[PDB]
Amino acid sequence: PHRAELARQLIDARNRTLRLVDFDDAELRRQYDPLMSPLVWDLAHIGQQEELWLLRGGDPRRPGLLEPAVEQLYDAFVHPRASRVHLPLLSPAQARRFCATVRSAVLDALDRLPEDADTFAFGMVVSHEHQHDETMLQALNLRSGEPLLGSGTALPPGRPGVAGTSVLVPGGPFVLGVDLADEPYALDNERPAHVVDVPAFRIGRVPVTNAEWRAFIDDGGYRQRRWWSDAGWAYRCEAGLTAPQFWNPDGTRTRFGHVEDIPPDEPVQHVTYFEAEAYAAWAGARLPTEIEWEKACAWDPATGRRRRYPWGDAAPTAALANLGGDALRPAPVGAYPAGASACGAEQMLGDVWEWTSSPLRPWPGFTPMIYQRYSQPFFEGAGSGDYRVLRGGSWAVAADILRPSFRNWDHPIRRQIFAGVRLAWDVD
Ligand SMILES: C[N+](C)(C)[C@@H](Cc1cnc[nH]1)C(=O)O
Ligand SMILES: [Ca+2]
Ligand SMILES: [Cl-]
Ligand SMILES: [Cl-]
Ligand SMILES: [Cl-]
Ligand SMILES: [Cl-]
Ligand SMILES: [Cl-]
Ligand SMILES: [Fe+3]
Ligand SMILES: [Mg+2]
Numbered sequence: 001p002h003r004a005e006l007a008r009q010l011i012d013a014r015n016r017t018l019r020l021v022d023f024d025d026a027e028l029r030r031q032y033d034p035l036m037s038p039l040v041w042d043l044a045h046i047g048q049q050e051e052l053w054l055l056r057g058g059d060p061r062r063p064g065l066l067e068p069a070v071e072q073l074y075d076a077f078v079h080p081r082a083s084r085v086h087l088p089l090l091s092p093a094q095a096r097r098f099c100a101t102v103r104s105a106v107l108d109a110l111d112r113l114p115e116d117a118d119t120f121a122f123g124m125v126v127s128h129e130h131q132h133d134e135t136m137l138q139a140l141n142l143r144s145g146e147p148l149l150g151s152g153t154a155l156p157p158g159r160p161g162v163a164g165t166s167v168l169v170p171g172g173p174f175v176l177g178v179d180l181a182d183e184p185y186a187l188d189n190e191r192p193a194h195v196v197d198v199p200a201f202r203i204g205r206v207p208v209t210n211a212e213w214r215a216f217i218d219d220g221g222y223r224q225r226r227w228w229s230d231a232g233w234a235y236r237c238e239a240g241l242t243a244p245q246f247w248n249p250d251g252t253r254t255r256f257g258h259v260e261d262i263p264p265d266e267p268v269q270h271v272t273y274f275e276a277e278a279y280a281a282w283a284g285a286r287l288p289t290e291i292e293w294e295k296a297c298a299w300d301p302a303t304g305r306r307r308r309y310p311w312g313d314a315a316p317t318a319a320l321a322n323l324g325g326d327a328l329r330p331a332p333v334g335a336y337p338a339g340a341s342a343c344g345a346e347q348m349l350g351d352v353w354e355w356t357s358s359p360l361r362p363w364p365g366f367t368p369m370i371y372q373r374y375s376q377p378f379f380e381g382a383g384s385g386d387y388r389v390l391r392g393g394s395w396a397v398a399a400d401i402l403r404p405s406f407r408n409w410d411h412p413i414r415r416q417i418f419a420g421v422r423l424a425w426d427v428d
Contacts, residue, residue, distance in 0.1 A: 003110050006122045009400055013129040017046055020136045025092045031085035035416055036139040040092050041084045042132045045074040047099035049128055053121045054106045058370040121370055123185030130398040137396050138416045140256060147257035158265045158332025162206045167344040171200035174299040175306055176291055177363045178405045188369035190405040196291055200427040203288055203296045206333035206346050207267035208421040216279050217243055227281040232274030235413055245270035245415050256328055265332040267352045267420045273388045273412030276355040276421040288424035290358035290389040298404040300342035310341035310348045316399040321350035323399045330395050352420030353390040353408055360387050360409045378409055387411060394418035
């Protein structure tokens with residue numbers, strides 16, 4: 001954009017990272033849960049990736065500041081999450097120094113770029129850092145002990161008449177995905193824009209709420225195999241799933257270490273894919289595909305055009321959506337009437353990542369970005385296991401890095417992510 005805007009975005013992302021590691025060294029070296037890296041791992045990994053993509057042209061053979069064997073400690077493919085706490089990692093002080101040295105060079109490089117030069121990698125790195133910021137928040141939410149973070153900033157109230165209800169998404173062709181001409185920092189798996197015919201379906205006006213989930217529990221939803229897939233039931237049994245994560249036996253939840261009542265009208269959060277599909281079956285519904293989800297979010301059947309955001313082309317604001325990390329929770333359903341998509345689906349962007357039934361797959365004409373291993377290894381059948389796509393972002397996602405076309409994904413057994421559920425239905 002303006003190089004000044006990119007600098008602003010990089011600085012904002014780093015400010016966020018540094019808030020998330022503004023704790024004593026022992027905290028940053030802890031493993032909060034075997035699913036998660038120590039925070040000091042993400043810190044150095046953020047710098048290493050910034051250096052690689054912005055200072056080294058994505059070519060590991062070009063020299064970097066770290067010995068290659070030290071650099072490789074931050075290769076997520078080489079080192080499983082649980083192992084990272086035991087690796088001979090850079091100290092927090094070393095990691096901060098490294099990140100700052102890299103950043104000084106990156107800001108200089110951005111100054112020196114020729115006019116009209118391509119800046120894609122800079123936006124890709126902003127996205128990368130913010131996504132690790134959300135990972136670090138997942139870790140801090142898993143941490144046992146007295147809270148390190150506050151309970152979150154104020155959110156708007158919800159309103160009646162939206163929970164449980166659905167909106168119609170009329171059938172026909174729509175444009176899935178985006179091109180760089182329209183979204184200059186869209187990641188490779190969002191491209192290219194192409195037409196898909198999506199039959200009529202209905203989608204939830206708002207996500208499934210906590211009170212609705214409690215009804216599933218109360219009716220024996222976790223005790224009735226018929227709602228679950230074979231794999232989902234097996235996992236429910238193996239893992240002993242009886243409620244969303246962080247829901248306590250006494251009816252409270254624990255959120256960033258804060259014990260509190262469970263708000264009835266918030267979107268349910270911290271459920272697996274398997275739980276989501278079981279709830280949906282029990283409720284008389286199903287999960288959306290990600291293609292259905294994106295049509296509900298972005299398509300305006302009155303103009304036969306995509307919108308940039310569900311509400312139109314205005315930049316996200318606190319009045320339109322719950323984004324950016326400060327709330328530490330999703331908002332009550334109905335809190336953002338002005339953020340509705342053309343079909344009336346609300347809170348599509350922000351609040352909770354929403355599970356879909358789609359595996360990650362390339363759009364026709366997919367081509368990888370400079371970080372070639374960002375999407376490709378996780379496509380269906382690529383050999384990294386089973387994934388399902390999640391859409392829309394959560395409360396933790398930076399507005400700068402989110403689009404209707406953005407695709408998250410995870411293994412269906414994961415629920416430490418800030419994920420919930422929106423229902424869908426066939427139309428006859
Ligand atoms: C798209 N997710 C969120 C699944 C990715 C983003 C990512 C960060 N560094 C490489 N990729 C992930 O956390 O592994
Ligand atoms: Ca969402
Ligand atoms: Cl990983
Ligand atoms: Cl990771
Ligand atoms: Cl596979
Ligand atoms: Cl993975
Ligand atoms: Cl899995
Ligand atoms: Fe990464
Ligand atoms: Mg309306």
